[PDB]
Design a protein around this ligand. Structure first.
Ligand SMILES: [Zn+2]
Ligand SMILES: [Zn+2]
Ligand SMILES: [Zn+2]
Ligand SMILES: [Zn+2]
Ligand SMILES: [Zn+2]
Ligand SMILES: [Zn+2]
Ligand SMILES: [Zn+2]
Lengths: 68, 313, 303, 573
């Protein structure tokens, strides 16, 4: 019981509860394999749709285009 | 064998938990109470609850509960440096030692001034909900420390105590019995400050008070005798009981045994255990050496709740 | 403006309604000893989601906490207590703690601003107000009591100051209710004193003598002073400018609105904090705004 | 007509029980160490007689329940702590007017009673699950019953009838008997989930019994039918000790608490949530509640454990309903004024009505502005166009003027600094930070070295809070990233980095690789395309499976199974 990581966008800590949808896709983890910066799936999808830089301030690499 | 006082063959025919298994109902109730008190989330943290258990078991020199409790305190995020002593402990439990004194040795000096100084404004203050858990914890650990030696169960400390030469005084403002009783007054207060604790304490108290005695020359009279005698040891006097039956219903060997167990539990020996009622079965000597913790806990809780009630009146 | 009547399905007077952080949820309470939560839908409809019983006395003010800590509520009632109810995942609300320290009924409970952690303040009818704190954020059951203040008079309302700057120390306003004909002030200001780590006496509104029934601080958003509101038999708005012990203040009076011809019960500000709202015994809601020259005037009457 | 004010006399010892004679002139007050009698006067009650006058403090005086009689003012009766049903007849002038002493009970008696029609028949009830009946002809006994339950409390006796008789127990059942048939209980019905501490009939309505208990409930039962039919139920603050019915009315009670609460409440059985009346002149729990009336509406006696005895009046009661807050309103995010008020404030006084009465520029401008990436002129012109397209004109003029001032026999260089700073203060002061923050970000070092740090941090934090309130995360993070102060460009650098592991070796991998040092298996393979994932990597928590962000979304739209293959619905549909 120590705090889990948080989205770089929501600043809210992550988590998923381990018909009625118990744990939607938008709340899953997702992270850059070069940065190790992560967040919710939905917020990262929205951020990289209109932008192209690592969501965290002072980070540099272009996270999405590395693999696409 | 778990115990050097009870024969291993007797235990097999009928680490200290397996001993209490010969009674099903009370084993279940005690395990429920222990689970709620020490494991479930509540007003205090788990590390603090284990430390409280440690300080309440390091009062009768029970080198069985001052063990596993410190062995599971470390595995719950606790500070390893704290075990150096109370001098290393934070200035939040230092207010608890003075009341830990009488809750194990001499219950009758508790009063409003003690709880008030505990609930005093400053840089380290308790609330009601977070000290009522503490006192219930202390009473539970004292009762377990008494019972473990009451069965003589086979599996540093002096740096954890303040003035460790206190002891229990014989006795002679007595406590009148049916002036502040659990079933009417105290239950409401404990339930209001602690709902689940009150119900579990209630179930424990009636479960222990429904056990039979079998071998007897009407298995209720000796129960009442062994139930009220320990109470008048502490200061609560029931006026209705005729106290000739107390001496006329319990052998002096039984009396010295129960006093040795409930006052100075480190003083019991195998000769002390066997010197009373050799013609019986060990569960009969267990159901008697096992109700004394319940009577002790009842008296301690009644005294503490009388102390706390006056603080609001 | 239009209205949409909602079937309360309560058994007694509704006391308060409070809105979620994101504006999509709202919570209700009543003297029928219950709390209900309503969420808006796609077609702008309101429907119930939870109707569980909370206390055993008349349930007064119910508040929401910031969703950074989760979906955690709070309440006070005739039972001299205070709860920190939380919703967990169908979903249902489960209790977490019960602060039982006051000898008299707890009147109001208000969460602190985010920038000072998770805190909770409760005012008691006998005149004692107390601040709590939960340093272990992830388990809302280790609540501790940090400060205790004596108000020498009955307490009816409480309001935090949302100023997020580090040039403003935290401060809390206390609303009295005693009607005894002995004059004396009602509203008082308590200001944190981080030098000594205690709440002090900062200012006292001497011009207030009639019973105070609700209080509120205006959201700041960038303002360099403080704006206060008071729900007396009239509606008053105060302005407090700190001069560069506690800080010394300058207390001015801006509005002396008396077109309710009744007793004003509640006051509520906006998010940007430029328009005020209030309701009185007459029965309608008024809105007040500034005419860009420190000259407030009514801008609507909703009934 | 009785005429008394609100007065409180004094006692030297705490009391536990009160009884009232038929003449409404004298009252019995008694406890463990007091057995006096008091007489009610027009102005002040004064001491009259002391029944406890024995030379030694014997144990057969510590009463717990005292009852007078309604047709013989000389008769008295009480229950001593250890079972002694000692009766007192004042006719004998021999000072301590005692009478037939009884000791034929086993344990602590709890309450005694009397027949309101006869003066010889006596009842009793104690801890043994027994009910001691007696005949005052000095007989031997009458009909000692077997309750087959736990401690009996609040025995009492019927009012209109002559033979009915009820009694409530400690585990939670109430019974009903008959004198002539002492073998079996006529009626059997459970009432509470705890000790039943109280019982009383209804003087007016026949068969309408009302019981109270430690359940913190008070329930009125209908005995007209053959079953135990409930009619009402009242929730209270604490355990209910005494339940008393006010005369000449049909729907009012009077209940006193047993712990914590020191207050009497006069509940209306119709309105069970808020008390009608309230008395607050005491310091400890009020042990006894008794009337003063054969039938009068507004006179109540009381007695507590603070050694006090006082008379009450309905008129002087601190009525709480008349002095409560009836309304409540709050503002919403966009505008959602929700108003609640009594049904007597909007148009039959115990209900409310709920209604909701019902900023786009802020939201529209948030994502439509431009903050960096282009030279000053491009940003200024684009922002001016964005403002003009909405309706705000002065802001567009400010944009254009800033572009003229910066993007330029010459004016002095630092000539416009005060004007720009005053603009920033003017826009920030009136509560519009969307302009001050944006202008600060765009102009950068040209103006940032003119304002103090605290005010800048205030602007930034307030604007970010407002933005997050509307769920505009993109622009909020945009402000975070380009924030010109150190204290704001740190919010997303705190606890946002994960630690990645290999599921075959269970050991960490470095921060800039996709392969395993011991395993050698490339541990970044999408479960859809079987290709190396070098960028974004989604991860289900119950499967430890995942892959490309885009692939997994399409697969999860298509079906509800883990693509790697394992019985697991990663979303539970
Ligand atoms: Zn990064
Ligand atoms: Zn997110
Ligand atoms: Zn990256
Ligand atoms: Zn590997
Ligand atoms: Zn892939
Ligand atoms: Zn899987
Ligand atoms: Zn899965």
């Amino acid at each position: 019981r120590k705090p889990l990581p948080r989205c770089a966008l929501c600043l809210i800590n992550m988590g998923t509860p381990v018909d009625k949808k118990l744990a939607q896709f938008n709340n899953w983890f997702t992270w850059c394999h070069n940065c190790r910066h992560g967040g919710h799936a939905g917020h990262m999808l929205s951020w990289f749709r209109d932008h192209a830089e690592c969501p965290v301030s002072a980070c540099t690499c272009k996270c999405m285009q590395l693999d696409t | 064998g778990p115990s050097a006082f009870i024969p291993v063959e007797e235990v097999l025919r009928e680490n200290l938990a397996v001993v209490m298994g010969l009674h099903p109902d009370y084993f279940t109730s005690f395990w429920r109470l222990h689970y709620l008190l020490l494991h479930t989330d509540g007003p205090l943290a788990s590390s603090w609850r284990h430390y409280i258990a440690i300080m309440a078991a390091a009062r009768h020199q029970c080198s069985y509960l001052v063990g596993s409790h410190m062995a599971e305190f470390l595995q719950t995020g606790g500070d390893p440096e704290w075990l150096l002593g109370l001098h290393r402990a934070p200035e939040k439990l230092r207010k608890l030692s003075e009341i830990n004194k009488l809750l194990a040795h001499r219950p009758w000096l508790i009063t409003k001034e003690h709880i008030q100084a505990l609930l005093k404004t400053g840089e380290h203050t308790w609330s009601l909900a977070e000290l009522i858990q503490a006192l219930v914890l202390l009473t539970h650990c004292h009762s377990l420390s008494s019972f473990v030696f009451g069965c003589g169960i086979l599996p540093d400390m002096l740096c954890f105590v303040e003035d460790p030469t206190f002891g229990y005084e014989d006795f002679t403002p007595t406590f009148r019995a049916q002036d502040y009783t659990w079933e009417d007054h105290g239950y409401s207060l404990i339930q209001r400050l602690y709902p689940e604790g009150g119900q579990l304490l209630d179930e424990k108290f009636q479960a222990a008070y429904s056990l039979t005695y079998n071998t007897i020359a009407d298995t209720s009279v000796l129960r009442r005798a062994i139930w009220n005698y320990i109470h008048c040891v502490f200061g609560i006097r029931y006026d209705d009981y005729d106290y000739g039956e107390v001496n006329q219903l319990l052998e002096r060997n039984l009396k010295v045994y129960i006093k040795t167990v409930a006052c100075y539990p480190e003083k019991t020996t195998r000769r002390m255990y066997n010197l009373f009622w050799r013609h019986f079965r060990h569960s009969e000597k267990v159901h008697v050496n096992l109700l004394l913790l319940e009577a002790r806990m009842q008296a301690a809780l009644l005294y503490a709740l009388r102390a706390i009630t006056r603080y609001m009146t | 403006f239009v209205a949409r009547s909602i079937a309360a399905d309560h058994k007694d007077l509704i006391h308060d309604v409070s809105f979620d952080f994101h504006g999509r949820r709202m919570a209700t309470c009543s003297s029928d000893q219950s709390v209900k939560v309503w969420d808006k839908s796609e077609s702008g409809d309101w429907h119930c989601t939870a109707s569980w019983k909370t206390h055993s006395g008349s349930v007064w003010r119910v508040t929401w906490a910031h969703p950074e800590f989760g979906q955690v509520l709070a309440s006070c009632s005739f039972d001299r207590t205070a709860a920190v109810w939380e919703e967990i995942v169908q979903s249902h609300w489960v209790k977490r703690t019960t602060l039982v320290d006051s000898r008299t009924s707890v009147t109001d409970v208000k969460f602190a601003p985010k920038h000072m952690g998770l805190m909770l303040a409760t005012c008691s009818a006998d005149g004692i107000v107390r601040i709590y704190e939960a340093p272990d954020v992830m388990n809302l059951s280790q609540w501790s009591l940090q400060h205790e203040i004596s108000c020498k008079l009955s307490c009816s309302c409480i309001s935090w100051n949302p100023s997020s700057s580090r040039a403003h120390s935290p401060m809390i306003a206390v609303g009295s209710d005693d009607s005894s004909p002995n004059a004396m002030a009602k509203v008082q200001i308590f200001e944190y004193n981080e030098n000594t780590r205690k709440y002090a006496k900062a200012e006292t509104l001497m011009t207030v003598t009639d019973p105070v029934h609700d209080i509120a601080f205006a959201p700041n958003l960038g303002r360099s002073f403080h704006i206060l509101a008071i729900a007396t038999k009239d509606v008053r708005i105060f302005t407090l400018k700190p001069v560069r012990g506690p800080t010394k203040f300058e207390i001015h009076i801006v509005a002396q609105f008396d077109n309710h011809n009744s007793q004003v019960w509640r006051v509520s500000w906006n998010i940007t904090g430029t328009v005020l709202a209030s309701s009185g015994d007459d029965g309608c809601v008024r809105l007040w705004k500034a005419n860009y020259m420190d000259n407030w005037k009514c801008t609507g009457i909703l009934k | 007509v009785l005429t008394g004010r609100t007065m409180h006399c004094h006692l030297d010892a705490p009391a536990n029980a009160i009884s009232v004679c038929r003449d409404a002139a004298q009252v019995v007050v008694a406890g463990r160490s007091i057995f006096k009698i008091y007489a009610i006067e027009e102005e002040q009650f004064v001491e009259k007689l002391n029944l406890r006058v024995g030379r030694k403090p014997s144990l057969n005086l510590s009463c717990a329940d005292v009852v007078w009689h309604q047709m013989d003012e000389n008769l008295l009766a009480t229950a001593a702590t250890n079972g002694v049903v000692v009766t007192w007849n004042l006719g004998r002038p021999s000072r301590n007017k005692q009478d037939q002493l009884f000791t034929e009970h086993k344990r602590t008696v709890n309450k005694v009673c009397f027949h309101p029609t006869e003066a010889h028949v006596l009842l009793s009830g104690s801890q043994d699950g027994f009910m001691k009946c007696f005949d005052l002809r000095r007989k031997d006994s009458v009909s000692t019953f077997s309750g087959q339950s736990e401690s009996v409390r609040d025995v009492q006796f019927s009012i209109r009838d002559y033979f009915t008789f009820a009694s409530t127990f400690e585990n939670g059942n109430v019974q009903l008997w008959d004198i002539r048939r002492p073998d079996r209980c006529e009626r059997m019905f459970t009432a509470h989930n705890g000790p039943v501490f109280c019982c009383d009939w209804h003087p007016e309505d026949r068969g309408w019994l009302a019981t109270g208990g430690r359940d913190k409930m008070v329930k009125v039962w209908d005995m007209t039918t053959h079953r135990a039919k409930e009619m009402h139920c009242v929730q209270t603050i604490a355990s209910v000790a005494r339940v008393k019915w006010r005369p000449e009315c049909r729907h009012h009670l009077a209940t006193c608490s047993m712990m914590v609460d020191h207050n009497i409440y006069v509940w209306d059985v119709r309105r069970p949530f808020v008390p009608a009346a309230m008395f607050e002149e005491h310091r400890d729990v009020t042990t006894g509640i008794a009337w003063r009336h054969p039938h009068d509406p507004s006179f109540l006696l009381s007695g507590s454990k603070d050694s006090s005895l006082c008379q009450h009046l309905f008129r002087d009661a601190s009525q709480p309903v008349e002095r409560a807050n009836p309304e409540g309103l709050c503002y919403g995010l966009f505008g959602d004024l929700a108003f609640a008020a009594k049904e007597s404030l909007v148009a039959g006084l115990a209900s409310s009505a709920l209604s909701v009465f019902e900023m786009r520029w802020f939201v529209d401008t948030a994502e439509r502005y431009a903050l960096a990436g282009r030279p000053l002129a491009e940003l200024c012109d684009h922002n001016a166009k964005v403002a003009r397209e909405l309706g705000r004109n002065q802001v567009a003029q400010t944009w254009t003027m800033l572009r003229i001032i910066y993007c330029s026999s010459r004016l002095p260089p630092d000539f416009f600094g005060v004007l720009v700073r005053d603009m920033l203060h003017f826009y920030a002061e009136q509560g519009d930070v969307q302009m001050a923050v944006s202008v600060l970000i765009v102009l950068g070092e040209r103006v940032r070295k003119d304002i103090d740090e605290q005010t800048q941090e205030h602007w930034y934090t307030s604007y970010i809070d407002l933005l997050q309130r509307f769920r505009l995360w993109n622009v909020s993070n945009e402000v975070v990233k380009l924030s010109t102060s150190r204290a704001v460009s740190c919010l997303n650098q705190a606890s946002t980095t994960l630690h990645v592991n290999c599921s075959h070796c269970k050991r960490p991998m470095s921060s800039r690789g996709w392969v395993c040092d011991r395993c050698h298996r490339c541990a970044s393979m999408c479960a859809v395309c079987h290709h190396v994932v070098k960028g974004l990597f989604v991860w289900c928590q119950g499967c430890s499976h995942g892959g490309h962000l885009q692939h997994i979304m399409k697969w999860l739209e298509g079906s509800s199974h883990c693509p790697a293959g394992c019985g697991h619905l990663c979303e539970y549909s």
